[PDB]
Every structure is written in structure tokens, then in C-alpha cells.
Symmetry: D2
Subunit: 380 residues, 4 copies
């Protein structure tokens, strides 16, 4: 019924055999056959399929309103499997500010295999239409993007992909299935770095993929079985377990996001704030039409590098570390941590200023997170 109930009872996460109310961890590589070719329950070799992995795959398929789920050893392994749907000579359109690991995989690995890529500003969907080439086979978008939270119209992107015969893919990591369901808007494939919100506890590296398309599912299953970037059973178990609290965690994060943004907008040491909930944000209306909540990632400008470092030092409840979607609130400086290889003038031109700070809001008390960040900003 409602989303919080679906998180508990969606998918198959009990043991039919013993009745165990949690998915058993099948730390196993192979399975007895009673006769050659007769599999007791469809399992024969864990790379091909493992029952704990099947459980997390059923969860992500259910939560995204798809039919087929796939669990990979990381988000970028999920992305690589999806890119491997294509052949040498095929072309992919992606948003211009796609995640750095995705950018790196495409431009330093897959271009060596003849995959062609163009990174365009998908905030206007006619930019996609202009970029379509005779060889284009795939449209891959994140929304909202990192670290400036640019929003792309999913429904229109799906319509463009359908009209031009493209496989459409949405990286739905930042929004999670709790708030945004691209398959419902006509997208072919949705994927996640489950390392972030889905696992939710900073203790699993994993990717998840869902689709309703039987033929794309067969192709993905073949790629997974052949290149072997599969998620192990312990990590699959911890994912199922973490997803149980996704709704509660995202709702707490959203209450905190709203209050933190109010504070940041009022504070004299903060300039521009980047988040899709802000009414003047580009494509705010599009976001509200395709999602019923918000990501916990916020970026905002302070004056310079020294102010950013001092802000980090002065907080009590914001933890300096990579990743996002923890139960802890995390803080980082993209110019120093993710975009340091880009020349400084190009960083500034892209809006990645020396003082741009990114926070990933966690599940601490809202008043504490607001007050802590405010008092730290007061020291600037």
C-alpha cells in the first residue's frame, strides 16, 4: 500500500524453508544437483545466481516498480554493465555534470572500446534532441546531479528516447526509490549506487539495477554472468537490512534539509545555495512533478578555501569524509576533493568555487544540525 509498508513487505525477504523472518546469508559457491540438470530451487552456481542476492534484487525491482533486479559489486560496476549493452561505434548522450566515476569510466575505459560519448546540458531537453547522432543508442541521465543539483526532466527524456530508439537510463542514487521512480515515467533502466542511501549505513559498496524490459533484463543477466561484477551474499544481506529503514531515514533527512536551507539562505556568510527545493532553482517545477521529496545533498558557497576549511573544523556533527547517504551528516569541498584535477579557472567557470561546500544531511536531530552549522558559519 503506502511507501513505508512497501519497504517492509515488498520483495521476498524471508525464508520459505524455515520461516526465518530475514533472508538467510548463502555464503556458498555451488549447489547440489539431485540429477544432472535438475536444480532443487533454480540455483547452480553463485556467480550466476545466489539466493541472498536474489532477495536484494527482488527488493529493488519491487521498489522501482520494475520486473527484474540486478546486484553488482559497486555502483560503477552497475554502470559498466549497463554501458556494455552497447557495441563499438555506438554513441551515448549523458548530462554534462555526470558523476566523476561515470565520466572517468566512459572517457578513460569505454572510449578505448569504441564507445562514443557526448556530455550535454540536459536541463533543456531539446539539447538532447540536437545531440542525437545516427549512431546514438543510449541516453544516460542523473537527476539531480552532483554537486550543483541540476534537474533533468525524466518524462520528456523517456519520450525522446522512445521516439529515437534509444535505451534510456536514469542514475537514481540521489533521490532513491522512496521519492523518484523513473521506470514509472517510461525510462528503460534505473540504477543506483546502493553504497549511498539504500544501504544507508556507510558499510556496503554495491550497485543495483532494475528494469521492466524482459529483453534488456536478459542482456544484463548475460553481461553480469560473463563479466562477473556480482554483489556478494553478506553485502546483499546488509543492503536488504538497510533498505528496511530507507523511508524513515529519508523523511528525517528531508525535515533537516528544509530547516538547514532556511538557515543557509538567511546567513550572511553564505552566498548561493544549490538544492531543487529552492523555488528559484532551475527546473524546480520539473523536480516537484517527478519526485515527491528531496535528496539530502546540498551545496552552498562560502567565501574561499580558508572559510570552507574553518567551517569544517568548527562543526561538531558534520564529518569530513567521502560518499553521501550515511546516517552521519558528511561534509566535503568539491574543489579540493572531487574536482582538484580540473584547472582552477575552469572550476570557477563551472561554479565549483574554492568556497563551494557540499553537505550530505544525515539523521541527527534537526535542531542540532541547524544550530551546529549556523554556529560554525558564525565563526567565519
Amino acid at each position: 500500500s503506502n511507501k513505508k509498508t512497501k519497504l517492509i513487505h515488498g520483495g521476498h525477504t524471508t525464508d520459505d524453508y524455515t520461516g526465518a523472518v530475514t533472508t538467510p546469508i548463502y555464503q556458498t559457491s555451488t549447489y547440489l544437483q539431485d540429477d544432472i540438470g535438475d536444480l532443487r530451487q533454480g540455483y547452480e552456481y553463485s556467480r550466476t545466481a545466489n539466493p541472498t542476492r536474489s532477495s536484494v534484487e527482488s527488493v529493488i525491482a519491487t521498489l522501482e516498480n520494475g520486473k527484474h533486479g540486478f546486484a553488482f559489486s559497486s555502483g560503477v560496476a552497475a554502470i559498466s554493465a549497463v554501458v556494455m549493452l552497447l557495441d563499438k561505434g555506438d554513441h551515448i548522450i549523458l548530462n554534462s555534470d555526470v558523476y566523476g566515476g561515470t565520466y572517468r569510466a566512459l572517457t578513460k575505459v569505454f572510449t578505448r572500446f569504441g564507445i562514443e560519448v557526448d556530455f550535454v546540458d540536459t536541463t533543456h531537453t531539446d539539447s538532447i534532441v540536437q545531440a542525437i547522432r545516427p549512431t546514438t543508442k543510449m541516453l544516460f541521465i542523473e537527476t539531480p546531479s552532483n554537486p550543483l543539483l541540476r534537474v533533468t526532466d525524466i518524462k520528456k527524456s523517456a519520450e525522446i528516447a522512445k521516439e529515437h530508439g534509444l535505451i534510456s537510463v536514469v542514475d537514481n542514487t540521489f533521490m532513491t526509490p522512496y521519492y523518484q521512480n523513473p521506470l514509472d515515467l517510461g525510462i528503460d533502466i534505473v540504477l543506483h549506487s546502493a553504497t549511498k542511501y539504500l544501504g544507508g549505513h556507510s558499510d556496503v559498496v554495491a550497485g543495483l539495477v532494475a528494469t521492466s524490459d524482459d529483453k534488456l533484463a536478459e542482456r544484463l543477466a548475460f553481461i553480469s554472468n560473463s563479466t562477473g561484477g556480482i554483489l556478494g551474499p553478506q553485502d546483499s544481506y546488509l543492503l536488504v537490512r538497510g533498505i528496511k529503514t530507507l523511508g524513515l531515514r529519508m523523511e528525517q533527512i528531508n525535515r533537516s534539509v528544509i530547516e538547514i536551507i532556511k538557515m543557509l539562505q538567511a546567513h550572511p556568510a553564505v552566498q548561493q545555495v544549490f538544492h531543487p527545493s529552492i523555488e528559484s532553482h532551475l527546473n524546480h517545477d520539473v523536480h516537484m512533478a517527478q519526485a515527491d521529496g528531496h535528496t539530502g545533498v546540498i551545496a552552498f558557497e562560502v567565501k574561499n578555501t580558508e572559510s570552507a576549511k574553518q567551517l569544517i573544523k568548527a562543526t561538531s556533527y558534520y564529518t569530513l569524509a567521502e560518499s553521501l547517504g550515511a546516517v552521519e551528516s558528511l561534509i566535503s569541498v568539491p574543489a579540493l576533493m572531487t574536482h582538484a584535477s580540473i584547472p582552477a579557472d575552469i572550476r570557477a567557470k563551472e561554479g565549483i568555487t574554492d568556497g563551494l561546500v557540499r553537505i550530505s544531511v544525515g539523521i541527527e536531530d534537526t535542531e542540532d544540525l541547524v544550530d551546529d552549522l549556523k554556529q560554525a558559519l558564525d565563526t567565519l
Copy 2:
């Protein structure tokens, strides 16, 4: 010093911090930074590096007399990472009877990316020399191969690769580092399905890669970080743990292999037997010169399909299942389980007869395994 000591004390498998005598399991995705860019112990994000994974990587590097180790989510993920060292238009030479997953990955995935492959009979190394093209960049060999245990001269293959500027790769799964060390014979990269003997307990799917070449190591690290087929920490821990007993397990397996082969050769219901320890086996001398023991995989002919099925039913201690390298002895019929998609006449021409049985010798009592297989053969 000696091999059994190196298995216990080689690599770094204790905790410098607490002194724990086993590697802690770092079920974690990210790491506190005390200042931006200052990593306490070199860790920042588990896809890039995880301390439990670093432990198993140090073990495989030590055991293969290499400098750098890499742990992947499966054997075929290790193989795919190694193939991704190449570009569209590059060519690979492999032995003609390479593992089916390797064959499938190369001919159904990587050929779509412009990688070219030729499968040649490497039991005569001049066949490699003839197959070298202007575009050849890699030589990839297993020895002994599956299921007929063909032997390829590693030292000569390394010399050919060096002379022609090829990256040389040995899939050393069947022999393990306990008996065969390709890096010592001049090979650039050695890899394993750790799913088999190294883990040894049929409870981890994993791949391991080692090299002494700093530049190839940098390229592999970049591929691993970018396509993300990494082994998780629980599976890394179970690998380290299983490798502890590798020497004892392989030695027991070898005692049993010798006695079982004597029995099979004497038995009137068995025709040809395939194993490198047999003195009339092709390249027996080459194998003994490059290895100081034997694989536990043996293939042998009984009369027909019905005899193979009856043999399987009549044994008490041979378990019908996929994979090899378990503590249990495993039994299978390649024509029905691995080569069933090949036409029957081509199977027969290749020696994969309907009655060809493959056993993976486990660590049960030698007398029991011999007597059990003999009494089952007596029912034919």
C-alpha cells in the same frame, strides 16, 4: 622459508593496531579524514581500497612472488579486468580449450568492443608464434586446461611474449600458487578463480590477480577503480582464512589423485584417463619442469551417458555439483553440464565423449575415495 610456512606467515594478515591475529573485517564504505586529503592509513573509499581486501591482495602477491595483488568479485571479473588492458583493434591469443566462461566473455562480450581473439593449440608453442599478428597484444594461457588437462609450456610462452612485445597472462587456477608460479617463469600477470582451491571451502566467489610489473599494476588498479568489480570485505576475509590450509589441502588431494589414477588405469570399465601426472600425457615433462605437484581435476572415459549417470548414482563420497577445489570430492559430466551447447559430433571430435566424467578430488580419506569410485565402477 618452505611453502607451508609461507602460507601462514606470508602477506600481512594481522592487525597492527590491536594485535588481532586475524585480519579485521572492514565492513565499511568510507573513512574519516583529519584534514582534507590527509588519510590516516591511506584509505579514503572502499571501492578504491579496503583494508581487508588489501590483506588478501598482499597474500596473493606474496604467494605468487609478485609485488601487487588485486581482488575481484569473481574469477571472470579478474579476467575481464585483464582483458580491459587492451583497446579496440587489439588481438589476443589463447589456448584452444580455454575455460567456457573465458571463451564466452571474449567471444560474446569483448568482441563487441573490437577485441580480436584466436584460440590455438598452445601445447606446441610454435603454434603461438604462427598465430601472432601485427595487432596481437596479449597471450593468455591456462595450464593444465579443462576438462582434458592439456599442458602448455609457461617459460617458452613467456619468452615468446617478451620477444614479440605481448602481455603474457596465465590462469593458474587449477595448479594454485602452491605448485606453480608463472611470475617466476617470466609471465607478466597471473590470475586465479579464488572460488576454487584458494578459498577451498565452496563458500566464496572471487578472483585474484598478481603481477610484479608496476605499470601493469597501475593500469589494473585504474580499471578496478573505474569498473568496480571489487571483492567485498567478508569474502576477502574468508579467502585469507581458506588460503591458510591451501598447502595441507593440496597435499592430501595429491595423495588421493595418485592412488585414484592407479585405480582408474587398472579398471576395465575405464578407457582413457586425462591427467598431467600420467607419463604418456602430452607435455608431461613440461608440466613436471614447471610445477612441483598436480591439480586435483581428473577426467576419464566410461562407456556412455548411462554409465556416467550410474557411476554418479553409485558413489557415496562424490558429490554432483558444479565448480572444483572444494573440500568435498565433486563429480560432473562435461558433455551434459558444460559442453551441452556444442553439437554432439563436434564434442566427440574434441574428445568430450558422452561417457567423459570429470572429478575434482577433495580431502576425504584416500582409501575411501579410491574404494568408493572403484565399487561404483564395478556396477557398470
Copy 3:
């Protein structure tokens, strides 16, 4: 600061060595010593202390505002360790409706060792004063109790224990440290079945104990080390992880409890409802004075056994299983599942009627849980 922040940042749950943001799992039994008697970080043998167990012990000590925490292999192991503080000939006062496992341990195990027990109605604290004997050494109370949710005044019980030289113990399982903190009210020892709300995911059996008393802590540490009912490292890790979401889970449970009770009170197929939030409940005022929220356990009367069974069959979101504090809502019938060995007339006299149903409210959507239970009651 506030409770939700303390749940994330209270205790020591990161790795000082690598900076890992989660507690490493020390699957280890012993620790290197650099010189005889010099422990690198205070660890020497995991029964005595294990770093992952130390982490969960620091969490429960912090959350209960104590100084010392102890992790046991189950709730009843924690209870047994606490009872072992006493000697043959000593006497314990407990509430009359204490948990069945506690009742069984005391009356079938510890009475064989000369421990004497009396079970009295502690809802009037002068009943405790009357029951005190010259040999009484301990007062052990749960509040609220199972399955009728009787409330005992903790502060007055602590005052009585102090005046009469008794060790006071509160089993705080049903309320959790998020809502009720007995050590702050003067109680000597607080304990939990962490199997329930603290772990929160029905996947760990564990007990936790906290105290501020250095001498009682030394005695408990000695008992734990000598009788060895210690929690293992994987279960300790899963406890730390589950406790992260305790605040969010308990708050969702409480919203649902309030609405479900309104529904039950209005429904013509339901008679008496048992929960401390109901204003006519005995010691409602005491509960509100010693707790700032509610347990998710509710009991209520339907007509008879057949109605209870039909209610269970008609629900979609209530799961028939033992235990409480899951993310799933659980349902049970005490007369058939926990009190079936008590004669029927004595059950009825105690209020455990054939139609008494117990629910443990989970974290599903509030509207779904209310509507589901209501429509199931409509079928009666």
C-alpha cells in the same frame, strides 16, 4: 545534544586506526603481544574483551547515561549474569508478571542454587517494602511488563532499594534507552534484550547491561569472563548498526501506536485495551513522569480463541511470530503461545483470556496498520 544526535555520535563506533566510519568486525580470538604482558591496545583474548564488543558496550553505556556496558549472547544471559551477583541464601524481589524466560530461569535454575525469589505486585511500591526480608539483596523490575503492560514507579523503587541496601535492576527492553533511562532515576543496573528494539531487525539475539557503579561493573566483568555468555563480534556489529536507527524507528512506532489505540478503543469487536498511554491505565501518571514516549507492545481483548485466530488470518501486514521490536508488525496470542502451560482458569484470573491478542507495532505506514487491523476486526 538531542537524542537523535546522541544515537549517531554517542559511544565509540569508528576505527581510530584507519578512520573507517563503522566499527571493524574483529572476527578473532587472540592478540599479538609485543612483550609478555604488554597489550598493544588492551586486548589479549576475545572472551575477556573484543574491540567490536567494546564498541557496542560503549554505545549502551552512553545511551543509558552509565559508565560501563556489557554485551551478552542473549537477554537471558544478561539476566543470568546479573542474578549471579548474588549468593546462595540471598533473596530477590521481582514484579509478579516478569517475562517468562526470567521467571523460568529464576524458579527452575537459580532456586536450585539457593537463590530465593518472591514475585509481588510492584504497581504499589509499598508491596516491595512489605516483601523485603533480612536476606533480600536485589530488586528486579520490568516496566511496562508483558503482556498487560503494568507500570512500576522506577524512582520510588530505586529509593526503596537504596534505603534497604538492595541492588536495583530494571529490565528496560520494552521502553529502550530512547524513552526511559533508569540509571538517571537512581537504579543500579539497567539491562535489555537487545534481540528486540535495539537491534531492531529481528536478526540478532543479544543482551546488553549498563551501570554507573564501578564495583558492580567489576563484579559483572568477572562473571562475564568466568561464565562466558559473551556476544560475538558479528552480532555486536549488527547491534551497533541497528541502534543507529532506534530513534527514527521508535518515533514511527509511537505514531502508529497512538492511532491504533484510538481505533481499538472505538471498535465494537474489541473490549479492554492495555497500554500505558491510556489515561485510565494504572500508573499512567507514573509512566509519563519516568518516560518520554511509549512501547510499541499493545494487548487487547477480542471475544475468544476463534476470533483471535481469525483476526490473525485476516490481516495483511501483521506477522504471526514470536519476539517484538521488529521492523515488521508482529501478532501473537499469549494464552496459546506464552502462557499455555498455565491452567485455563488461572490464565483467566490473571487476565490472559483466550481472546487476548498482543501486537508489536512495527514501522509500516500508520494508515496501513490502522486500516488493516480495523478491516480484520470487521470480519469478526
Copy 4:
């Protein structure tokens, strides 16, 4: 059939449901019931029974030729459960040099509950007969003992216990079920610290108990369920896994023990050597009649404390740490590490000299262990 086969195929360690060739890890606390009281596979609450724990219990019952197995959170938890078979006023006879944890539990915990104990020299079994009191209910023996490896006649002890109506218990930790089977010699209960050889990898703390007596089994099951010192599922899994290699590990250890003892006896810096394989050892004949191999624990005298410390520093392959039965060879000095609270003159009188060294032989290469210990002794 033979012991090495029984280690692989004895007990139930596969999944009947999926066919998984290893025991699934049931990280779960409770189980769905299809109707009230109908358990799908006999499971209802993990403290009472858990399927992974049931697997390790079936293994230890099979290996000891018993009917019922029990898995506890530590060796001393197993011992405490067995002692709890008795009542206040009952008396236990034990060997005089019983393990320090056992001594401590009995004399500092269970004597407070009215259990009476006498520690007698059981190397002459008529000492047991003299010590029997009207209140004696239990005879508890280790053989061989620590650290001087005293041997007690198991068969005669069982006969004495039967004649006098005593429960007989053997702590079989040092010998393991691979070499010594007390239940076959008439003993009622056998127990192990599975922390040592059975797990074998220094990564699980656990106890195991086996019996053939249905009534004692019912009593132990009740004690386990009521005091809750149960082994968790991950540790149960790691035990099953470690036991697979018990035979290979013990046989390697025994080859090394024989050669090391030869070296120690020949070395001028070593005085007395303590091990049951030495023909002049008291009850050598008894040991050979009740066991078909040897423990890996050896004690031997060097001159003084400084020589012992120097010996430890000079070895490369002997690790200073607590516990025994690792894959690593371990070394310790009882006078400083286990018996330091005993006065020095009483230590000397008992044979625990300042120079007494204890080694636990691991599975490193035999020649390396002999040569390393010899060269270290040469520095004295």
C-alpha cells in the same frame, strides 16, 4: 568410513532447500508460523534453536559418536552449563591441574551457589575413589592437562563414575574428536573449547558439548535455553568451516610435534620436556590406549625467565599470544601469563618454573619449526 571422510560428510552441513553445499547463515531471531504452534521446520526463536547452530551441533555429535550436540558462546559457557546440571550441596571431583578458567569459575562463582569441589590427582584413578563423598554427583577430567600434559585414564574414570552414580565429563579440547572419543569409552558428556583446534583459525570463541544420554541432553537444552549462553550463527558457520580441515591440521601438527620433541630432548639448553608421546611420561601407555594421536601442546624447561624471554625474541615462526590450536605456532610462559597470581615457591613446587615454556604447534613446515626453535635455543 575413515576419519578424514567423516570430517567432510559427517553431520548435516548442506541446505536441503536450495542444495547449497555449505550451511546457510541464519542471521535471524524469529520464524514465521503458518498457524499458531505449527513450525515449518521446527524453528520458532533463535535462542531456543537456530539452523546454523543446529548444523554445528550435528557435526560435534557425529564426530564424538554421540546423539546430541550443543553450541555455546565460549568454552567456559559450555563448562558452566554442564556444572549447572548440579544443585547446591552437590560435589564435583576434578583433576588437580584443571584449566585456570575452569578452576576460577568453580572456586569463585559456583562455590557461591553451594557447589562443592575437590581437585585431586587423577593420574592414579584410585585417588578419585578416595575422594568420592556421599554428596559427589560429577567427575570432570581433562586429559592431557595444561601445561604439564598429565594423562588420566578415561575408561577407568567412566567405570568409577558408573559404579558410584556420577555424571562423568571429559574436557577433550587438547586431543579433539580426531584423536580421542570419550563417549566411546563410557563417559556421559564430552566438551570442547572450540576456540582452539576445532575452529582452528583463531577467529571464533565457542564451546561445544556432546552426549548420547537423552535425559542429560534434555537437561542441557533446558539450561541453554534458560541461561542463554548460545553460539551465534556466524560463529557457528565459521566453526563448521574450520572443522572441515581438522584432520589435515592435526596430522601436520603431529608430524611437527614428533620432530620438535626429538630436537628438544637433544638440546643442551632444554631440561625436562612434557608431552604424552614421550615413553617415560606418566601414563604414556594409558594415553596410547585411549587416543590414536597427540595434542600439539608441548611444555619444556629452559634455565630461567631471561632465557624464556630471549627464546621468544629469537624465534621467527613462534608467535607470542594467548590460546592454542591456531594455524600459527604460539609460544607462552605460564609462570608469567597464566600462573602469575600463584606464589613463586608454590609455582616451583608444582613444576611451573620460571623457565617453563609452552608451545602450541601450528601447521607451518616441520623443518622450519624445528630449525627455528633450535637456532633460537642455540642463542641461550
